Nucleic acid binder design. Structure first.
Length: 111
DNA sequence: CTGTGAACCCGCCAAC
DNA sequence: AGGTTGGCGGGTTCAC
């Protein structure tokens, strides 16, 4: 029975919502400073970095599986604006959302 | 790009 | 003499 773990699982399932890190902290019955420390010490990353990281990976999935527009995806991935999506996506994957989907559909027409 | 304002987040450290 | 906690300061990142 692990509340730090339970909140991580909860985050994944509920990536599409937008929440304070302070929120996650509360949902894990910890002070911020504890949450922050214990999170990183478990996760390898800090909360909103990990959030971003995860949200991006969901974008990557939707860009592969679905036909939602880049702008429709940012919403489904919890990004507050389509401009933030491009930003974090480009930074950790190496190309824009569209350009990534474009290369994929070409290289792997079949899925 | 540029700019303002808020959020994060990690070292430091006294305090259990 | 081992360890976890949590406010606080404020550079860096995020967001618009």
């Amino acid at each position: 029975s692990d509340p730090l773990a339970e909140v991580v699982a909860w985050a994944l399932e509920h990536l599409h919502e937008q929440f304070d890190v302070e929120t996650l902290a509360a949902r894990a019955y910890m002070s911020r400073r504890t949450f922050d420390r214990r999170f990183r010490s478990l996760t390898g990353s800090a909360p909103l970095q990990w959030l971003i990281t995860q949200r991006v990976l969901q974008a990557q999935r939707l860009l592969e599986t679905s036909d939602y527009s880049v702008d429709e995806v940012a919403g489904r991935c919890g990004f507050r604006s389509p401009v933030a999506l491009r930003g974090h996506f480009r930074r950790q994957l190496g190309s824009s959302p569209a350009a990534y989907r474009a290369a994929y559909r070409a290289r792997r027409p079949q899925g």
